[PDB]
Structure formats: structure tokens, C-alpha cells
mmCIF file of C-alpha atoms and ligand atoms in Angstrom:
data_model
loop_
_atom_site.group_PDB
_atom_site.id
_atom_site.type_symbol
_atom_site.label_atom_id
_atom_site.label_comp_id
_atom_site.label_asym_id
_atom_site.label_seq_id
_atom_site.Cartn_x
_atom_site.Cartn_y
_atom_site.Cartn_z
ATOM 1 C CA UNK A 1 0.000 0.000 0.000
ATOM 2 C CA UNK A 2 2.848 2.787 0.832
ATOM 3 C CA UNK A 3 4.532 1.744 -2.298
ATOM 4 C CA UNK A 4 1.418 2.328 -4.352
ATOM 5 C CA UNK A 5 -0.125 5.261 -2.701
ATOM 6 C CA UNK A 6 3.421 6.540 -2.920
ATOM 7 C CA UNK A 7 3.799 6.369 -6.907
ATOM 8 C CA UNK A 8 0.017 7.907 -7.364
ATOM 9 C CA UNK A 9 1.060 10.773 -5.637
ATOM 10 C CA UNK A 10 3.966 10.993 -7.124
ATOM 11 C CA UNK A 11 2.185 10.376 -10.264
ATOM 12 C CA UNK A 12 -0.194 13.246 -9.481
ATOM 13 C CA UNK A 13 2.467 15.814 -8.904
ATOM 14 C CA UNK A 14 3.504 15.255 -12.408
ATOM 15 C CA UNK A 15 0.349 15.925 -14.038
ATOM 16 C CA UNK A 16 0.330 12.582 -15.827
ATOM 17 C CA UNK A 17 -2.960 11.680 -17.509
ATOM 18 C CA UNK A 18 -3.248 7.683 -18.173
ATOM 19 C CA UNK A 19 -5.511 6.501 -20.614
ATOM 20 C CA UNK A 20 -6.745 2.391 -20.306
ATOM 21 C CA UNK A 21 -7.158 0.388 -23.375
ATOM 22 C CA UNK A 22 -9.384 -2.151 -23.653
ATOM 23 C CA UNK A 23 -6.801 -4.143 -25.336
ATOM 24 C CA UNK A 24 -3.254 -3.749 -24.651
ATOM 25 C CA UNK A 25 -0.508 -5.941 -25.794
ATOM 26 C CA UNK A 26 0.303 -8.629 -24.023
ATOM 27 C CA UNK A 27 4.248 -7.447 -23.256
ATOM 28 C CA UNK A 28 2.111 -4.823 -20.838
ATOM 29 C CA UNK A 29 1.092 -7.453 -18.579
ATOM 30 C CA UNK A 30 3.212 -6.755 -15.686
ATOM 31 C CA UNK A 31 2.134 -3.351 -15.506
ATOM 32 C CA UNK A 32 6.389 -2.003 -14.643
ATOM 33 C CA UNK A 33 6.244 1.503 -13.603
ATOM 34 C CA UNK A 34 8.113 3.060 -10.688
ATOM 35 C CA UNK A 35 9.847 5.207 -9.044
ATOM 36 C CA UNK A 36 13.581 4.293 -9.145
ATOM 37 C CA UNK A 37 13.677 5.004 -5.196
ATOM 38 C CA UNK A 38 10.161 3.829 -4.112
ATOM 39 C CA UNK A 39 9.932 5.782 -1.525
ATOM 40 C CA UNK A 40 11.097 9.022 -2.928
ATOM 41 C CA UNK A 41 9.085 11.120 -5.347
ATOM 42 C CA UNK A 42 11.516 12.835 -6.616
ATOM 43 C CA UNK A 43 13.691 9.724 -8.109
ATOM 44 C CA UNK A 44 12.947 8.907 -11.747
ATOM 45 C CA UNK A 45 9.875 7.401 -13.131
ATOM 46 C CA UNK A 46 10.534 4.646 -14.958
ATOM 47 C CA UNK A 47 7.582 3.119 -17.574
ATOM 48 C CA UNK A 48 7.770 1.111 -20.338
ATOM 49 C CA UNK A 49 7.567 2.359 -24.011
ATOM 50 C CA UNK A 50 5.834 1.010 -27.204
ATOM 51 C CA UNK A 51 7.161 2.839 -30.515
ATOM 52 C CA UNK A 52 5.435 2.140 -33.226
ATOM 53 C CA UNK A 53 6.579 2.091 -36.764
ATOM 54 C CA UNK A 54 2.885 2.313 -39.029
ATOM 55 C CA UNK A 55 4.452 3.287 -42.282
ATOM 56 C CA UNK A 56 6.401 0.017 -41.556
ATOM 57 C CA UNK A 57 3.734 -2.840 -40.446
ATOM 58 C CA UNK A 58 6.687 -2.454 -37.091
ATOM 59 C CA UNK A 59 6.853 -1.527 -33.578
ATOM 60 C CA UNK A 60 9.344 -2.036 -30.830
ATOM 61 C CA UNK A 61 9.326 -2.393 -27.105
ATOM 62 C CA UNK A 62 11.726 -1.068 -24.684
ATOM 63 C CA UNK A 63 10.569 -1.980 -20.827
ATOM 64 C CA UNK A 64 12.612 0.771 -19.428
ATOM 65 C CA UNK A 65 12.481 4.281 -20.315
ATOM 66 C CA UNK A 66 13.149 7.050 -17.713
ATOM 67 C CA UNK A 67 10.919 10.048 -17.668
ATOM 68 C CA UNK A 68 14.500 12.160 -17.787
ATOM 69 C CA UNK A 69 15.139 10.540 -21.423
ATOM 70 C CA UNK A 70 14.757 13.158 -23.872
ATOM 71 C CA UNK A 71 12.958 11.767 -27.521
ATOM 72 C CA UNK A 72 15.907 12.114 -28.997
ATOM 73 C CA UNK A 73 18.023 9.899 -26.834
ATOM 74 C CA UNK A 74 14.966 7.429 -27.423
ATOM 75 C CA UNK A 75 15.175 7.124 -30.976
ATOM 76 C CA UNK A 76 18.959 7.616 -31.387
ATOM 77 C CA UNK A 77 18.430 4.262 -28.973
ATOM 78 C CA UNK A 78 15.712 2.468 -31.172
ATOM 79 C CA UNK A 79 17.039 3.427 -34.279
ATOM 80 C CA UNK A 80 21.076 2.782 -33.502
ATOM 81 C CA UNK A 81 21.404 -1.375 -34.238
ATOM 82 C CA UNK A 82 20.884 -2.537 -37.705
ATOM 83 C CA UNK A 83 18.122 -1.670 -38.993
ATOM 84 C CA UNK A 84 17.018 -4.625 -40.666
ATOM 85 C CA UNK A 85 13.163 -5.052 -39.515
ATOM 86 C CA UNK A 86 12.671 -2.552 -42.067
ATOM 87 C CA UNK A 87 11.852 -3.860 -45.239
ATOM 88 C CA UNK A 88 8.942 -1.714 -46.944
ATOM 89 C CA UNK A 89 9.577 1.360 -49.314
ATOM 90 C CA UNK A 90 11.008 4.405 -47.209
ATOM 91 C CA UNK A 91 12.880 2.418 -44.800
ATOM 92 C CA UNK A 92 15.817 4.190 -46.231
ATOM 93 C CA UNK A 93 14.535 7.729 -44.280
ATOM 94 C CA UNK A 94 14.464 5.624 -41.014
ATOM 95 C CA UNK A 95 17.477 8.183 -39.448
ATOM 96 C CA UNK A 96 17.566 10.267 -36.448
ATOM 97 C CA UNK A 97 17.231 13.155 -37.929
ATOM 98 C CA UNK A 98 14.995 12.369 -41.116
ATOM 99 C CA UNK A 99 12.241 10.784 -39.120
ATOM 100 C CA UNK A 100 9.541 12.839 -36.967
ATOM 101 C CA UNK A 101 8.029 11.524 -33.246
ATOM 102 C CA UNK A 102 4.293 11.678 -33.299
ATOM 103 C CA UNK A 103 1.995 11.318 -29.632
ATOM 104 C CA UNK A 104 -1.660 10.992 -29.271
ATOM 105 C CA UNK A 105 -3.492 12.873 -26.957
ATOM 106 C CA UNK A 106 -6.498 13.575 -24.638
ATOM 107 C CA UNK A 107 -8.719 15.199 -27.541
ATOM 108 C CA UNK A 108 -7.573 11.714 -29.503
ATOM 109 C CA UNK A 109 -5.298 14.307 -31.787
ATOM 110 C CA UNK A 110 -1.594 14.224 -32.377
ATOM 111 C CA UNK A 111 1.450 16.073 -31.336
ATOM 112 C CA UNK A 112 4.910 16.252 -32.820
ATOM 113 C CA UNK A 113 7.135 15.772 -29.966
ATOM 114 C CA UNK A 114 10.221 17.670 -29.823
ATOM 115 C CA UNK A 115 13.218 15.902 -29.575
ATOM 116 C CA UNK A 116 15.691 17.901 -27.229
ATOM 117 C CA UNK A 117 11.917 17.638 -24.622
ATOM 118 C CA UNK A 118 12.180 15.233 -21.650
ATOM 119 C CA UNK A 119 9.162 12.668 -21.328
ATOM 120 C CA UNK A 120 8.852 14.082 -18.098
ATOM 121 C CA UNK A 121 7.692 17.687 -19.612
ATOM 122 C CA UNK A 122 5.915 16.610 -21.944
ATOM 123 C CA UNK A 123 3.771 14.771 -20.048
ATOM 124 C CA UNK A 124 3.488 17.495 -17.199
ATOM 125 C CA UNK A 125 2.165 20.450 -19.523
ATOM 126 C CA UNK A 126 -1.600 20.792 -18.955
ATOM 127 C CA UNK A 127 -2.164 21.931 -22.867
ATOM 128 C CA UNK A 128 -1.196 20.049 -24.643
ATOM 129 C CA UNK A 129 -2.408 17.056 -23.029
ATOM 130 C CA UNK A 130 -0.151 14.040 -23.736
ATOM 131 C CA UNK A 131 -0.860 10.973 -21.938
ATOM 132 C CA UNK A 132 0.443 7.641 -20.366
ATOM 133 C CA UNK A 133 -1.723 4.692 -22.625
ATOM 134 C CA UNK A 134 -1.706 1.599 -19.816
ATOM 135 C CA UNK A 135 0.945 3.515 -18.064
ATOM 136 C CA UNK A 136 3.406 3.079 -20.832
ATOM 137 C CA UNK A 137 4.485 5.465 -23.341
ATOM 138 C CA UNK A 138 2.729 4.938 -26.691
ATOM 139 C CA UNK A 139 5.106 7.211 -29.439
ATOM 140 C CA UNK A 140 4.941 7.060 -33.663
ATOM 141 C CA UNK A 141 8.092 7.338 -35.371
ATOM 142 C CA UNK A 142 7.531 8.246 -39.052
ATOM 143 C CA UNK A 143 9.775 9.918 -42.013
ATOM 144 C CA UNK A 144 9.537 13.924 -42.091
ATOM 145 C CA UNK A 145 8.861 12.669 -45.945
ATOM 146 C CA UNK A 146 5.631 10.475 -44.938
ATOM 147 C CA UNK A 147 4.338 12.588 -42.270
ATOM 148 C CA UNK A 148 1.713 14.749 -43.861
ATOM 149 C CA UNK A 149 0.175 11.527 -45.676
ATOM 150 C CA UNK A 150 0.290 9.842 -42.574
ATOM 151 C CA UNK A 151 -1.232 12.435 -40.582
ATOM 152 C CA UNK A 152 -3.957 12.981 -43.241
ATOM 153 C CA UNK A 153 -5.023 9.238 -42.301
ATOM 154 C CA UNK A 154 -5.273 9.248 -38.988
ATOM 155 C CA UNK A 155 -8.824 8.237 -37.545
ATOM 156 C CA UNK A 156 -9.496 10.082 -34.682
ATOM 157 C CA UNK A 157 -12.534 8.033 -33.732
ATOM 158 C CA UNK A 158 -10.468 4.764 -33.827
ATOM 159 C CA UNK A 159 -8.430 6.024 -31.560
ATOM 160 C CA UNK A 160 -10.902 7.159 -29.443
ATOM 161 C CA UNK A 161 -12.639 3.673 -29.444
ATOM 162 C CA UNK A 162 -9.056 2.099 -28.705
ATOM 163 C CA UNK A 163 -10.227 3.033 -25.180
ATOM 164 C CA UNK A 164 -12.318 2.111 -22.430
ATOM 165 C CA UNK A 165 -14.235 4.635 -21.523
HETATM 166 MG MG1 MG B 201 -0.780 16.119 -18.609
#
């Protein structure tokens, strides 16, 4: 109980909005997120991270990410090894710098994320309102080239019904 209550105030003091899913993947099972000192708010929050690739048919999962991890750091991480799981047209502009980080939000919208921004700030502003999805971070990396097309498609309604409430 003083773990938990601990990490929802913690949680709280953030400004962190979590969104359920009615159905996550199964690598969220475990529900992992915590402080890295449990009893001390002001230690890192740790959650996992799904980043999807959708131009791709791709997405990876990193059970680890700390809230002081700026985007870039993130997807100079995801992006670093051989990049082999690529194998559709474009996966040529899958660089640090040639791709763009998309997140949903409250409104069911999406954000371009900067990439020198902490996950801890972005997820603190009150507007815009970025949230936790299953209290994991849910991000889209897509080519700068592909972005407007993919934008164009998103379905703000299936998104919203991704949801449980
Ligand atoms: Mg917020």
C-alpha cells in the first residue's frame, strides 16, 4: 500500500494523464512503472515504451524508459542497431534526424514531440495534453517525408474507441 499510494502521488504531482485500453498488448502485462527510489518522489519514473513504426507494419518495445530521457536519446536508442526489420519502401529515411516523433493525446489528436523535450515535460504540460496509454508510453516514429500523408489518415474516432471509456 505505501509503495502504491506513494507512486500515485507521485504520479499526481507530475500531471500525468493515463488513458486504459481495452486491449493492450500482451508485453504490458506486468504493468512495470516506478519510481527508481520507491519511496522518494523525486527519483525517476521509470515506464515502459511502445514505438510504433505504421508506415512500416513495425513496432518495438523497450521496458525501461526514464521520464528524464529526452525523444531524442529514445530514438537515437531504437534506431542505432541494424536496422534490418525494415523492409517496406522508405525504410531508407528511417534516421535520427529524417524521421519525426508523433503522440496521441487527450482530444484523440496528435502532437509532434520535440526531440531535445524530456518525457517528463511533456507529459506534465496541462495543454497540450499528452498521456500515459496503460501507463506506458505509446510514441509514432515516421519519415519527415511520410508525415503529412500519414497524418492525413489518422482516424481520430479509432483512436478514441481504442479506449475504455
Ligand atoms: Mg498532462
Amino acid at each position: 500500500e505505501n509503495k502504491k499510494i506513494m507512486l500515485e502521488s507521485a504520479m499526481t504531482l507530475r500531471n500525468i494523464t493515463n488513458i486504459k485500453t481495452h486491449s493492450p498488448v500482451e508485453l504490458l502485462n506486468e504493468g512495470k512503472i516506478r519510481l527508481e527510489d520507491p519511496m522518494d518522489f523525486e527519483s525517476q519514473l521509470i515506464y515502459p515504451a511502445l514505438i510504433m513504426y505504421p508506415t512500416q507494419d513495425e513496432f518495438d518495445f523497450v521496458g525501461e524508459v526514464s521520464e528524464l530521457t529526452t525523444v531524442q536519446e529514445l530514438v537515437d536508442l531504437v534506431l542505432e542497431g541494424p536496422q534490418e526489420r525494415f523492409k517496406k519502401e522508405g525504410k531508407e529515411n528511417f534516421t535520427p534526424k529524417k524521421v519525426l516523433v508523433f503522440m496521441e493525446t487527450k482530444a484523440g489528436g496528435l502532437i509532434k514531440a520535440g526531440k531535445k523535450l524530456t518525457f517528463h515535460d511533456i507529459l506534465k504540460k496541462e495543454s497540450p495534453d499528452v498521456p500515459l496509454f496503460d501507463n506506458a508510453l505509446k510514441i509514432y516514429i515516421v519519415p519527415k517525408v511520410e508525415s503529412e500523408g500519414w497524418i492525413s489518415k489518422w482516424d481520430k474516432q479509432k483512436a478514441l474507441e481504442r479506449r475504455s471509456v
